[PDB]
Tab-separated table of N, CA and C in Angstrom:
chain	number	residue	atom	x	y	z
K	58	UNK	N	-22.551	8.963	5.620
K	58	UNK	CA	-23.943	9.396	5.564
K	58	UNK	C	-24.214	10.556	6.513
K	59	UNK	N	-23.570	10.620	7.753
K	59	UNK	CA	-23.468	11.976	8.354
K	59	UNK	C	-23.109	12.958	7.663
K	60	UNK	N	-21.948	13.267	6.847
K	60	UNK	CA	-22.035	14.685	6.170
K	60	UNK	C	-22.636	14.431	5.346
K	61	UNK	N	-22.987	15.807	4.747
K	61	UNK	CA	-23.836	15.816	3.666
K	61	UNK	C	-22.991	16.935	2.686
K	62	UNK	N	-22.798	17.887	3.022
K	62	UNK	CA	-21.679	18.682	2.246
K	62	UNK	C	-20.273	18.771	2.530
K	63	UNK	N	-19.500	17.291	2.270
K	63	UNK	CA	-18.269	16.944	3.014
K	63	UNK	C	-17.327	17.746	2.260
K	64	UNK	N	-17.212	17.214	0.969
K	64	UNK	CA	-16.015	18.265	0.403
K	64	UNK	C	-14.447	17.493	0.614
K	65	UNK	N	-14.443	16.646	1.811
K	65	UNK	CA	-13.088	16.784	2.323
K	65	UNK	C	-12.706	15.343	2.718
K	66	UNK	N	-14.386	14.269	2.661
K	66	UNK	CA	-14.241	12.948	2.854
K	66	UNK	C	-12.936	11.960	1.494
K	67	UNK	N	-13.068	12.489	0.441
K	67	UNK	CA	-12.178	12.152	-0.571
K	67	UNK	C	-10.462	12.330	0.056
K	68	UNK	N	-10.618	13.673	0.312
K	68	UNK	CA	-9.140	13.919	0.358
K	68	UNK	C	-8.855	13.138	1.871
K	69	UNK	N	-9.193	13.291	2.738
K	69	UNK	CA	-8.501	12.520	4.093
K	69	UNK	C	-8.404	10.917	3.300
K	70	UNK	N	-9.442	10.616	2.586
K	70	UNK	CA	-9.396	8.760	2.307
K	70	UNK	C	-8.198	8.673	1.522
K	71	UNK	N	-8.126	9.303	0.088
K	71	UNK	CA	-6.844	9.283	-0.540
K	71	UNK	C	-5.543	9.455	0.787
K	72	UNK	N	-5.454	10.272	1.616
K	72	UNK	CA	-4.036	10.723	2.353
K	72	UNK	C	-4.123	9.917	3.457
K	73	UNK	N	-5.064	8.867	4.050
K	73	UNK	CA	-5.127	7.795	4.555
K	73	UNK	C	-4.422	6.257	3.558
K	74	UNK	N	-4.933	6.634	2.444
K	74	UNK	CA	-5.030	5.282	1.498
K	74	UNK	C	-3.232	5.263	1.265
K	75	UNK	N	-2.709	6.688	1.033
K	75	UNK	CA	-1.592	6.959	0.836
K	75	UNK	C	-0.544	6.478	1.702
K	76	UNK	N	-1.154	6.549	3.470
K	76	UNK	CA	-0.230	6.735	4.590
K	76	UNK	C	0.186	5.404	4.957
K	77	UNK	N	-0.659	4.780	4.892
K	77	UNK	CA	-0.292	3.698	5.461
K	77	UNK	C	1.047	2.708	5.436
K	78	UNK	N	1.653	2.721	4.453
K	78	UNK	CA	2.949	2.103	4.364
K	78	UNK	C	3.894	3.212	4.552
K	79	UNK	N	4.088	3.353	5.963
K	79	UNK	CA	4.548	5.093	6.970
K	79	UNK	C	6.384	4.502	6.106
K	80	UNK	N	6.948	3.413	6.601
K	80	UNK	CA	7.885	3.355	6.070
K	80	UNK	C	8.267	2.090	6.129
K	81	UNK	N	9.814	1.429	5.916
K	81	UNK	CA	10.085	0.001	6.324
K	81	UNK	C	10.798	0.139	7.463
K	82	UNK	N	9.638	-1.387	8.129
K	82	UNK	CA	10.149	-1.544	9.923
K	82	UNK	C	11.779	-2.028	10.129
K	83	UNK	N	12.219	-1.212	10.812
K	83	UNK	CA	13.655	-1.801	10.983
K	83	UNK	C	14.269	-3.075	10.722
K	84	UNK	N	13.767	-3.769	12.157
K	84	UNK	CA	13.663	-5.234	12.688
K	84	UNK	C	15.298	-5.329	12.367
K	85	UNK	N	15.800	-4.683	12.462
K	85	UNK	CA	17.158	-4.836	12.579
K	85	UNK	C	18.531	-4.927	13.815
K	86	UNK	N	17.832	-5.987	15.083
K	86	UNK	CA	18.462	-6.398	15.974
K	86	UNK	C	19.539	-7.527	16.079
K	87	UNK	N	20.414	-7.205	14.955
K	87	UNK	CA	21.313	-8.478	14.714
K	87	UNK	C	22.792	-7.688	14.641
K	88	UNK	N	22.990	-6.871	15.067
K	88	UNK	CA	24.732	-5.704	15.018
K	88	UNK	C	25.276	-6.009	16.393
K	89	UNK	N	24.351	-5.416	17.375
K	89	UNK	CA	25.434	-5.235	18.471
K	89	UNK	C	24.281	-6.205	19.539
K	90	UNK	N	23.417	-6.811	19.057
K	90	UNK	CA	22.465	-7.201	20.348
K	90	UNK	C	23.320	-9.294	20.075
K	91	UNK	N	23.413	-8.608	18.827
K	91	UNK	CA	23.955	-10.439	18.550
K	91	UNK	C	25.176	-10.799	18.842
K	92	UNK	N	26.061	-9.824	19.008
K	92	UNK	CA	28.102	-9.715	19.288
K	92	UNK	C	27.718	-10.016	20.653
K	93	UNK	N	26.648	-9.142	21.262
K	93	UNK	CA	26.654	-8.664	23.013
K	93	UNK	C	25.920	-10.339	23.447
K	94	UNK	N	24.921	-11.025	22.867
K	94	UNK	CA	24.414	-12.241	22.787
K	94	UNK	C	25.741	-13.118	22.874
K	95	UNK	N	26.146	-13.109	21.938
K	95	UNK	CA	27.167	-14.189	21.451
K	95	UNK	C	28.472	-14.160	22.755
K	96	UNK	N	28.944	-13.535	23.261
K	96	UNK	CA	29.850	-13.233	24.105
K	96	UNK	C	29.391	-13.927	25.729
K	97	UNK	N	28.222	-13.543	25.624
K	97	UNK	CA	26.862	-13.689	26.508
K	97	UNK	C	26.897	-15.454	26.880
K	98	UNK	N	26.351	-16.253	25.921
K	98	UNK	CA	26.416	-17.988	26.098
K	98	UNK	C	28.237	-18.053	26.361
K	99	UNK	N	29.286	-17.387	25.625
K	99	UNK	CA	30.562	-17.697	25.144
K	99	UNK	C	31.213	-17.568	27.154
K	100	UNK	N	31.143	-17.079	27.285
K	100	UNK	CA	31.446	-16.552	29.292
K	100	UNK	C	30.592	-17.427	30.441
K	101	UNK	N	29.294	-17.390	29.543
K	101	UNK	CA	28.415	-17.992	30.283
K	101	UNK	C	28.529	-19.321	30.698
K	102	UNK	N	28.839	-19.828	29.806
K	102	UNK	CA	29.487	-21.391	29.434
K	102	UNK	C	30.564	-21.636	30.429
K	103	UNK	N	31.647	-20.704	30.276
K	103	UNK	CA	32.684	-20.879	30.803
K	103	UNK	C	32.440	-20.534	32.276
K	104	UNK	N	31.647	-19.904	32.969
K	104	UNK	CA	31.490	-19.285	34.170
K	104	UNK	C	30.775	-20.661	34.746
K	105	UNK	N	29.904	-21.526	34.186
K	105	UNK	CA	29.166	-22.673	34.341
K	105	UNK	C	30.382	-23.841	34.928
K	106	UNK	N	31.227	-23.677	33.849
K	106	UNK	CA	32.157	-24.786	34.036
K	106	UNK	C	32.749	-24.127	35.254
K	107	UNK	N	33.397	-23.298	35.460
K	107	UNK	CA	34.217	-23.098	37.041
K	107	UNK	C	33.444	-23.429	37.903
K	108	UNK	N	32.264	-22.490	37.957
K	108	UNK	CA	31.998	-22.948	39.112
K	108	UNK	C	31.013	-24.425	39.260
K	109	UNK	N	30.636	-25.500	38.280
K	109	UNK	CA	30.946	-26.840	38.626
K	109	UNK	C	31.803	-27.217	39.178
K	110	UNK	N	33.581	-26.873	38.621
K	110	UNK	CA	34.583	-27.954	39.216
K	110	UNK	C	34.904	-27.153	40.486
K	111	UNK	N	34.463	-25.826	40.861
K	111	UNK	CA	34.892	-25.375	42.116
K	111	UNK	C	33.918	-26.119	43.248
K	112	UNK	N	32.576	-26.347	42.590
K	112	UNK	CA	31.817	-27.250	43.571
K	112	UNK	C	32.122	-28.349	43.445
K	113	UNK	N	32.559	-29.006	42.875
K	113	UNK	CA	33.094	-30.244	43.055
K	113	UNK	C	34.460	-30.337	43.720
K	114	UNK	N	35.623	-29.626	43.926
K	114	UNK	CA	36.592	-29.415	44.874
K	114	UNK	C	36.491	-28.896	46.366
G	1	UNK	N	-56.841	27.390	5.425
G	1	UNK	CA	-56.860	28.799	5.917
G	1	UNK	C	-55.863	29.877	4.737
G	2	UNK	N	-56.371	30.662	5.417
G	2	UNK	CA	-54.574	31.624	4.785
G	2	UNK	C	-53.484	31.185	5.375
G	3	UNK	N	-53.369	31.416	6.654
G	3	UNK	CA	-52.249	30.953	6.633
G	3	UNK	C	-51.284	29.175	6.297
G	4	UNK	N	-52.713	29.125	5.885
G	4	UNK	CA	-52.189	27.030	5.147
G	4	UNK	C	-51.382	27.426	3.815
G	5	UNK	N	-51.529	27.992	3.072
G	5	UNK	CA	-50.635	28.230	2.387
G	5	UNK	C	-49.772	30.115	2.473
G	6	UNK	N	-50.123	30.961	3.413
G	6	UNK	CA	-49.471	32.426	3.654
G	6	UNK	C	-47.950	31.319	4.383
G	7	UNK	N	-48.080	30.612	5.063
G	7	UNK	CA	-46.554	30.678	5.601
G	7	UNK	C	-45.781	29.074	4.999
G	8	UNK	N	-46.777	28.625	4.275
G	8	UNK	CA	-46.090	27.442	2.990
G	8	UNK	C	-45.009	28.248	1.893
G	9	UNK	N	-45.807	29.124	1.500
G	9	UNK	CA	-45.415	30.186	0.433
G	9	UNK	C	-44.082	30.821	1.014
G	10	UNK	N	-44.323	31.152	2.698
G	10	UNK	CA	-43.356	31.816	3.369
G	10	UNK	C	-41.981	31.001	3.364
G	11	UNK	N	-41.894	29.810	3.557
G	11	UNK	CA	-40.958	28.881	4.031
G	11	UNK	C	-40.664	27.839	2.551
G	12	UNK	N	-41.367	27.986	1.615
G	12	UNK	CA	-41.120	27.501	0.310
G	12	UNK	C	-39.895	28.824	-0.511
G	13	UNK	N	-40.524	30.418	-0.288
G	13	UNK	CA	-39.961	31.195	-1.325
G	13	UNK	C	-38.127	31.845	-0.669
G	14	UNK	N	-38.836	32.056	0.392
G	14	UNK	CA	-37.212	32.513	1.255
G	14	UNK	C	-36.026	31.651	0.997
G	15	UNK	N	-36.701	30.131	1.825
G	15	UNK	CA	-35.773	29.185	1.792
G	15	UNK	C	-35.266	28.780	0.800
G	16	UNK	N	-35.502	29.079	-0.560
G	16	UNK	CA	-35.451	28.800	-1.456
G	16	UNK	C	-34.223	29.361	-2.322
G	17	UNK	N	-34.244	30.779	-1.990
G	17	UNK	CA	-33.227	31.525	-2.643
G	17	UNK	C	-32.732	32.277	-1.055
G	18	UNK	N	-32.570	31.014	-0.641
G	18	UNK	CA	-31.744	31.269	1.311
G	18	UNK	C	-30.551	30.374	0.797
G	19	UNK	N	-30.873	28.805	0.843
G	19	UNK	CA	-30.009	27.777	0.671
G	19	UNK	C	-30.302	26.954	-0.018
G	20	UNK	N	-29.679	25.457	-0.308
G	20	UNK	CA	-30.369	24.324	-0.880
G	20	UNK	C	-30.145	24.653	-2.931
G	21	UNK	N	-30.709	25.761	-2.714
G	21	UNK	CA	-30.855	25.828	-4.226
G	21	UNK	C	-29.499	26.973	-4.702
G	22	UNK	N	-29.145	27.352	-3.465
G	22	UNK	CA	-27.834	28.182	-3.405
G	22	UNK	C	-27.977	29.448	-4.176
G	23	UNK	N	-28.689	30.472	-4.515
G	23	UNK	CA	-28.917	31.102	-5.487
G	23	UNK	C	-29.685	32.711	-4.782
G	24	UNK	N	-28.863	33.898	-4.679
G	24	UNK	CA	-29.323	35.408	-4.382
G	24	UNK	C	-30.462	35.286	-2.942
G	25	UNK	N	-30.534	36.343	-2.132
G	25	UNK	CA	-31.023	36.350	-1.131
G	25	UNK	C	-32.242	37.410	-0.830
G	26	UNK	N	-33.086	36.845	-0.768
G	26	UNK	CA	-34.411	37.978	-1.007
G	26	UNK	C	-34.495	38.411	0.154
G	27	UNK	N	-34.967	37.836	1.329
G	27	UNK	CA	-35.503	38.326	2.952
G	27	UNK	C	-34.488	39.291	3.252
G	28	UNK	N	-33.711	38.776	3.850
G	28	UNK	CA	-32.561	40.090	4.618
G	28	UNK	C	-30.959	40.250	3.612
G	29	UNK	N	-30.574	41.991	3.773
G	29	UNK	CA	-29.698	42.008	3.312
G	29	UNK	C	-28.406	40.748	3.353
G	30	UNK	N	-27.642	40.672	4.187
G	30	UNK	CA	-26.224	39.556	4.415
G	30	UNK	C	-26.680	37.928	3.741
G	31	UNK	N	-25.869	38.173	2.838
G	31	UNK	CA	-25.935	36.651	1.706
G	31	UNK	C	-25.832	35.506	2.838
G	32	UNK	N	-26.193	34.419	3.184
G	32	UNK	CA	-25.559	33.211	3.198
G	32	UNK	C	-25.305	32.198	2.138
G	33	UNK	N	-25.304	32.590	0.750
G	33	UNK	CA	-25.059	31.827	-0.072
G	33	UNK	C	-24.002	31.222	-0.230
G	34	UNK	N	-22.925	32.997	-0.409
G	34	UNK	CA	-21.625	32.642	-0.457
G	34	UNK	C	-21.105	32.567	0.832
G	35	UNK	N	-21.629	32.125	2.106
G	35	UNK	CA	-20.649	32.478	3.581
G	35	UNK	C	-20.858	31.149	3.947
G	36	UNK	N	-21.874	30.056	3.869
G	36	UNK	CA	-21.516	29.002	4.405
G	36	UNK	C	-20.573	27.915	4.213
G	37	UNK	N	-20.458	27.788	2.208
G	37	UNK	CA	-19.566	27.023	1.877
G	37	UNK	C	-18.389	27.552	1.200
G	38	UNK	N	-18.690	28.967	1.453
G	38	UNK	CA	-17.160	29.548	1.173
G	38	UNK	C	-16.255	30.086	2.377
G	39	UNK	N	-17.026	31.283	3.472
G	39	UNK	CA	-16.169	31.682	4.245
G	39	UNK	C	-16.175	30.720	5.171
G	40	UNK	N	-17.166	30.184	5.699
G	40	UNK	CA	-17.264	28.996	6.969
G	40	UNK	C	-16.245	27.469	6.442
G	41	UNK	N	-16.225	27.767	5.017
G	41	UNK	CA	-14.879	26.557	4.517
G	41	UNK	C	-13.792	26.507	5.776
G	42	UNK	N	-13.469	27.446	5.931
G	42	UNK	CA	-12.140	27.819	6.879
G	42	UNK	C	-12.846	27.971	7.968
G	43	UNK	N	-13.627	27.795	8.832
G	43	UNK	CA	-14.420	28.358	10.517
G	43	UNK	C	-13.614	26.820	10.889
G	44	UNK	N	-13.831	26.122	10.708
G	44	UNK	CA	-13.535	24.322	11.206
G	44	UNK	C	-12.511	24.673	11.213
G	45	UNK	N	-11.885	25.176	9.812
G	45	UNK	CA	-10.436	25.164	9.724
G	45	UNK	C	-9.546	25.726	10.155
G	46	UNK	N	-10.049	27.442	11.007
G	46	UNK	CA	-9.533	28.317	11.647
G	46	UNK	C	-9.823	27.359	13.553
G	47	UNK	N	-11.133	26.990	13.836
G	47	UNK	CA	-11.107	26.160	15.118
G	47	UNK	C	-10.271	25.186	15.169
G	48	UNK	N	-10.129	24.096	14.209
G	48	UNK	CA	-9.463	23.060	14.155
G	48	UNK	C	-7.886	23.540	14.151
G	49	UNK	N	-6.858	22.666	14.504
G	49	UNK	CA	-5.221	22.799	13.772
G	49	UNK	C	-5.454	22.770	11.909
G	50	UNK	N	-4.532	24.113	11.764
G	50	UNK	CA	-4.730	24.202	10.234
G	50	UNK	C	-3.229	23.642	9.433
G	51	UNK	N	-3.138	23.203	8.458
G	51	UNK	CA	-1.639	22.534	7.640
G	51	UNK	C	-1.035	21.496	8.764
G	52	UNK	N	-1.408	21.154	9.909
G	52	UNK	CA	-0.654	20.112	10.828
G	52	UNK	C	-1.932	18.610	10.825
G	53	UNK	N	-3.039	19.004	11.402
G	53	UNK	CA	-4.099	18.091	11.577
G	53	UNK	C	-4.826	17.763	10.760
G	54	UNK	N	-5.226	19.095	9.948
G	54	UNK	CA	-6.424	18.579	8.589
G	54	UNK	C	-6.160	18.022	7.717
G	55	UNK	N	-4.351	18.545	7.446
G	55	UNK	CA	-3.861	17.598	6.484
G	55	UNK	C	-2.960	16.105	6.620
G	56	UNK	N	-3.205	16.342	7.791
G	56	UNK	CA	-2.404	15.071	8.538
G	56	UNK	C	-0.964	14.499	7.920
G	57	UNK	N	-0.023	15.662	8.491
G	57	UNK	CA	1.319	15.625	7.918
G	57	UNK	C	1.739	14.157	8.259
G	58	UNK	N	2.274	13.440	7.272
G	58	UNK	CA	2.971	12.452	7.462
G	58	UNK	C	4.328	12.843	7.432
G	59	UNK	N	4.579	12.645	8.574
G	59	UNK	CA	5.502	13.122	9.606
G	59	UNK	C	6.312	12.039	9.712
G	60	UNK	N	7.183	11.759	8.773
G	60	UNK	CA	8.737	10.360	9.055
G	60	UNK	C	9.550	10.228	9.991
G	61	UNK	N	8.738	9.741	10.915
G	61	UNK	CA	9.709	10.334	12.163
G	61	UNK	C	11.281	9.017	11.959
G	62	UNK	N	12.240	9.593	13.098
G	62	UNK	CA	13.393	8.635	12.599
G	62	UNK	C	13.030	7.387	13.476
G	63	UNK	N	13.661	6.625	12.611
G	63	UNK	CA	13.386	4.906	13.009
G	63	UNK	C	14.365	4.704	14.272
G	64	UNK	N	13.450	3.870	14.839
G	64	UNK	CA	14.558	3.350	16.203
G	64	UNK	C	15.735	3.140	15.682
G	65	UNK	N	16.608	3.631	16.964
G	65	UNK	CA	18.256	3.089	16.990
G	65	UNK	C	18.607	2.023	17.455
G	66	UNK	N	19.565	1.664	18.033
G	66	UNK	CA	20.199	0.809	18.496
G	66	UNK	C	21.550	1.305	19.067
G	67	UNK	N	22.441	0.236	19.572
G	67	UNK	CA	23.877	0.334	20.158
G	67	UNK	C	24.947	1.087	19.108
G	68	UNK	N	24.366	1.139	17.816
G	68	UNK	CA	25.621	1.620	16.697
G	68	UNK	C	26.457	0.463	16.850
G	69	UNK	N	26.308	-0.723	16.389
G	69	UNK	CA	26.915	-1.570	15.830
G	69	UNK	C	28.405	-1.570	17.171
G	70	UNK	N	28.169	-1.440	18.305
G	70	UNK	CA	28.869	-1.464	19.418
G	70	UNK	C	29.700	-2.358	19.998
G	71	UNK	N	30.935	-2.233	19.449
G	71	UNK	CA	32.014	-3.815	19.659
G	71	UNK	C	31.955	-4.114	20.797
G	72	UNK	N	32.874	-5.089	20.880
G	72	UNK	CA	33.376	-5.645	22.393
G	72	UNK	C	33.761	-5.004	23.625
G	73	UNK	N	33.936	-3.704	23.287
G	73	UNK	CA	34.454	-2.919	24.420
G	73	UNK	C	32.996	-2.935	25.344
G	74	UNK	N	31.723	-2.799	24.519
G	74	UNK	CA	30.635	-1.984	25.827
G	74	UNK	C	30.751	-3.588	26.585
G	75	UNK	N	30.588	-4.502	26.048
G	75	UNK	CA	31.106	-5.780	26.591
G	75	UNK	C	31.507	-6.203	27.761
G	76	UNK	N	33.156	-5.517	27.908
G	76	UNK	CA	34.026	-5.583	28.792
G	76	UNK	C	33.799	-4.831	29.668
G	77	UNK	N	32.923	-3.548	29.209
G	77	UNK	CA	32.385	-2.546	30.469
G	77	UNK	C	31.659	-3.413	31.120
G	78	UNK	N	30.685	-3.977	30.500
G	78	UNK	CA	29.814	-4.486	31.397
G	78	UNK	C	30.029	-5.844	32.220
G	79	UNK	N	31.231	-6.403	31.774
G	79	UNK	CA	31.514	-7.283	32.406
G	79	UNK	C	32.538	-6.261	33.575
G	80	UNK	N	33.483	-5.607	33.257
G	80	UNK	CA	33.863	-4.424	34.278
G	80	UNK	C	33.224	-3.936	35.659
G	81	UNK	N	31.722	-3.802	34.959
G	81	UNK	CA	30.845	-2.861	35.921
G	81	UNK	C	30.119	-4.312	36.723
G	82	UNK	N	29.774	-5.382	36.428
G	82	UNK	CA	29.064	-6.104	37.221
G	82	UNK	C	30.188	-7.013	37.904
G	83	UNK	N	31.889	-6.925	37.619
G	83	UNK	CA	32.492	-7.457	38.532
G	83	UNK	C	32.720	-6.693	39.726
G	84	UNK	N	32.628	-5.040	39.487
G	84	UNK	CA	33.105	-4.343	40.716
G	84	UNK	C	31.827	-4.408	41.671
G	85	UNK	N	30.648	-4.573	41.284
G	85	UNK	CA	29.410	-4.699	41.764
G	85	UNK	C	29.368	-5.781	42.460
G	86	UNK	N	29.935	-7.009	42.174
G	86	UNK	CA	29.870	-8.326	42.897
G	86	UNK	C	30.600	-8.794	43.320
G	87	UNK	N	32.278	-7.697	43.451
G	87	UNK	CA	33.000	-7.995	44.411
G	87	UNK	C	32.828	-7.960	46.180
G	88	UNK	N	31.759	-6.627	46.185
G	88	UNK	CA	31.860	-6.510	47.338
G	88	UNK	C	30.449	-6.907	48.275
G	89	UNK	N	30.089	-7.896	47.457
G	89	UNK	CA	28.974	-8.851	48.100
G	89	UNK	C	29.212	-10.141	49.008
């Protein structure tokens, strides 16, 4: 209702209406965050156990 | 008076074929017929960013990265780098 001789309110709404799905979100943290994870509990585990039986000796 | 309708007449006939009705310019030579919604089209558009902002380039920028699918080696670095780090603690 502010403009009155817009001209240009159509085209930004269409190239808004257009934009919005910019692209598809990655979300693809499962390559090297999950190997580097997995290794991660796999050491971790084992680093747990030494030093239990070293405190216990 | 006269002037109840001398400057009704005034501000009815000018304005009339000034703007609004968009149509030849009686009072002073320089049209604004064709300069407000034709050359002033572009004044916003020459002030404003022109082909970047008005049209609001959708601009794809590249999607986050990551490690590149980064084997076991960065791994061993890092088990490398935080043993030499906590040897000498």
């Amino acid at each position: 209702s502010v403009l009155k001789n817009t001209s240009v309110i159509d085209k930004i709404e269409s190239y808004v209406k257009q934009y919005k799905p910019v692209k598809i979100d990655a979300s693809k943290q499962l390559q090297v965050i999950e190997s580097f994870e997995k290794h991660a509990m796999t050491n971790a585990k084992e680093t747990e156990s030494l030093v239990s039986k070293e405190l216990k000796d | 008076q006269d002037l109840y309708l001398r400057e009704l007449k005034d501000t009815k006939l000018a304005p009339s074929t000034l703007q609004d009705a968009e149509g030849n310019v009686k009072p002073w030579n320089p049209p604004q017929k064709p300069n407000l919604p034709e050359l002033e089209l572009q004044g916003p558009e020459a002030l404003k960013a022109y082909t970047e902002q008005n049209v609001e380039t959708a601009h794809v920028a590249k999607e986050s990265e990551e490690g590149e699918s980064e084997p076991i080696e960065e791994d061993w670095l890092v088990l490398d780098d935080a043993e030499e780090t906590k040897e000498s603690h």
